[PDB]
Paper text:
In order to obtain better understanding of the additional C-terminal helix, α10, in Ms_orn, the structure of Orn of Escherichia coli (Eco_orn) with the canonical Rnase-H fold was also determined for comparative structural analysis. Eco_orn was also identified as a dimer by gel filtration, SEC–MALLS and PISA. The nature and position of residues forming H-bonds at the interface is similar in both proteins. Interestingly, estimated Tm (50 °C) of Eco_orn (which naturally lacks the C-terminal extended region) was similar to that of Ms_ornΔC, suggesting α10 aids the higher observed thermostability of Ms_orn (under mild denaturing conditions). The denaturation curve of Eco_orn shows a monophasic manner of transition from folded to unfolded state, whereas both mycobacterial proteins exhibit a biphasic transition. Once again, Eco_orn, naturally lacking the C-terminal extended region, appears to follow a different unfolding pattern from Ms_orn when monitored by either changes in λmax of intrinsic fluorescence or [θ]222 nm, suggesting that the unfolding pathways of Ms_orn with the extended C-terminal tail are different from other Orns.
Oligoribonucleases (Orns) are highly conserved DnaQ-fold 3′-5′ exoribonucleases that have been found to carry out the last step of cyclic-di-GMP (c-di-GMP) degradation, that is, pGpG to GMP in several bacteria. Orns are highly conserved DnaQ-fold 3′-5' exoribonucleases with a DEDDh active site motif that degrade short 2- to 5-mer oligoribonucleotides in 3′-5' direction and release monoribonucleotides as reaction products. Removal of pGpG is critical for c-di-GMP homeostasis, as excess uncleaved pGpG can have feedback inhibition on phosphodiesterases, thereby perturbing cellular signaling pathways regulated by c-di-GMP. Removal of pGpG is important to maintain the pool of free nucleotides inside the cell and to prevent mispriming of transcripts and is brought about by Orns.
Numbering used by the authors:
A (entry chain D): 3 to 156, 159 to 181
B (entry chain C): 3 to 154, 159 to 181
Amino acid sequence: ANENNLIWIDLEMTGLDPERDRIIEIATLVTDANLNILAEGPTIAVHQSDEQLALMDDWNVRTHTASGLVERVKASTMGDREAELATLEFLKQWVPAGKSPICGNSIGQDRRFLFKYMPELEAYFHYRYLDVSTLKELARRWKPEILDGFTKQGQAMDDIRESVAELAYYREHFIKL
Amino acid sequence: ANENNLIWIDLEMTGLDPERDRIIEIATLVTDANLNILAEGPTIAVHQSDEQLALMDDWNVRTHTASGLVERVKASTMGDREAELATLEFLKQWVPAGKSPICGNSIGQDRRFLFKYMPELEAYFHYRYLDVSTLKELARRWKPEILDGFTKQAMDDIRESVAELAYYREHFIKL
Ligand SMILES: [Mg+2]
Ligand SMILES: [Mg+2]
Ligand code: NA
């Protein structure tokens, strides 16, 4: 455990509305304060009912079926609470409660789903947000030149590792240390 | 009107839980892409019931009573919907729909209340977030030296947030 470590997280959901939609995937990963990847946490397909999956709009059915996530959700024996507790069992080994901001890309949406469906995991984070896309937005406005230099190869944890590498790029090319 | 303008916003709430708590203040302000303040929007006390105000924990009762916001809430004839529409009437003059990220300090909480209580104003923002406190967090971890150089009413908070982002632009970003 170290109080400067960062919790990175990436959810998949059935849609964008926490009131109607559910979490169907959680992945976590911990870095040190300098973005050295310490440990990859468990990628868990979160079981939801056939009823709930049938409410998915066409974009979500297409994406989550093609990826194999829909199959893994149907087969999963872990609901919201089991996935929450397994994620906490992983994070407790690496980061104390209330210290890491929520880190990732478009993490405001993810935190909304944590508040509704995994409030204990939500509480484990510092109140603050580290959305890498905050730096992409500023870069696009103040220094667009640097955006040509970074590329994504287009898997939850591939997205997290890409988010870490993206923050590291902004640390070298956008920040002044 | 200009596609590169930024919407800055600060809500006050009765508490932290959108399921139980309500918006009691909205303030907005628009900057250009380089943080030049173009216009201060309306600061509106959002009417909520005496029942709802009575659910406030000690921190919220102390803060919102002392500021005079509780008096203004009781006197207000603008609910969620009227405050939403008045805010949109101001923002339409300055920024097209779907262009500005939500800008401010600890703004994820505010957006949660927009989703529940002002979904039309929420939709007016780009899906993205510009939380200045994201840069404060990185600064604290990567360059704490610069935090001693900067030191800190809804709109005072927003103007302070703009000045804070401007500080990080000079002392933390490399242009
Ligand atoms: Mg994502
Ligand atoms: Mg505030
Ligand atoms: Na928290």
